Design a protein around this ligand. Sequence first.
Ligand SMILES: Nc1nc2c(ncn2[C@@H]2O[C@H](COP(=O)(O)OP(=O)(O)O)[C@@H](O)[C@H]2O)c(=O)[nH]1
Lengths: 88, 306
Amino acid sequence: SVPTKLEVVAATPTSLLISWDAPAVTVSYYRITYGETGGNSPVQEFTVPGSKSTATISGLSPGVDYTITVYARSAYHRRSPISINYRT
Amino acid sequence: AVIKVIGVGGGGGNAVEHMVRERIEGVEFFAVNTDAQALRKTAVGQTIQIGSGITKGLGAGANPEVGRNAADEDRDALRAALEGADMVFIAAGMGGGTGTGAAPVVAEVAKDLGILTVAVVTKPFNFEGKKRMAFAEQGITELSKHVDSLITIPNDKLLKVLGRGISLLDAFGAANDVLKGAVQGIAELITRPGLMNVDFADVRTVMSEMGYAMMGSGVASGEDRAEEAAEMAISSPLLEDIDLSGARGVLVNITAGFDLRLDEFETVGNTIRAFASDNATVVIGTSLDPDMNDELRVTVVATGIG
Ligand SMILES: Nc1nc2c(ncn2[C@@H]2O[C@H](COP(=O)(O)OP(=O)(O)O)[C@@H](O)[C@H]2O)c(=O)[nH]1
């Protein structure tokens, strides 16, 4: 379970700002995936440095429900990703 | 290959509790303790109580001698539980009573059955004091007489990657995670092989009767993932105390999805074979994690380091 809390902190019609808790051990980078809940499209993906605790997802569409998933990639654990849903 | 993972003492039990919770595919979990109440408290697989005659189920009193005598009294139960395994990982926090004293007995029993016997053990944090560190070092010396490979993870090394203001409780959680990643990083070559599948006989070759070992891991994303992850593993703080060209064996696990390029496997292996001695036993394989995209993990176990 890393990060241990994930939330949408701000939302606009085409973007979501997500926030998570600082990790107990060094994270090399985070992998962030997102796509429409139950979609025939592959999820889109990007990475952010392991020193971040927020990220902005842009290029979204209004009134679409999205599944967002954050992987903390660390040399020191193999913990599972955290996932949330949010409708723009 | 049949893999068993045995936690010994309270720290080893907490580590196995974490591996059961977070899951390691294809292995079978056990917990060995002199404290019967601790054995029953959490889900840790099948429980093996040792030394009920001498301890009455009340623990080892932080005394390695009692841990030894408890395990000695119950070699029959230990052998009965170990039988059938091809490989066993013995996990213990060294410096207490049960892990320090019983883990070498568990290992001796397993060695006697012909099982490939890998210990994965921690040394205590500096703040746990000099006596626990002394107990840990004596137990590691005793353990090294009866294992095939003994991987040491010094908790003092984990200190320098811990976030600031971390709770005392989360610091021990991190030790569980490293132990879990350690067992998983070796076991997955067997239980989740990729294209370059390692034969268990070659695992045995690089791990059998080698003595002390250390490991390090690296992770990376993007076009340079292979070079970056390999260099990160070799620069790992868990490996920094050894000269890799001194190891008699090197086992490498590249964890990837379905997109591994030939030149990436070439790159990792060339980097390993450059720093490894010309007479080392070198085994490099891949494992499969299908939930990776454009990323890679490299895990390096330096074996036979003296
Ligand atoms: N991984 C891990 N290690 C621990 C934990 N608690 C203690 N340790 C370490 O394990 C060492 C031995 O303590 P413990 O296992 O409780 O003693 P034992 O039951 O007598 O073997 C301690 O000195 C700590 O360095 C834990 O929850 N997880």
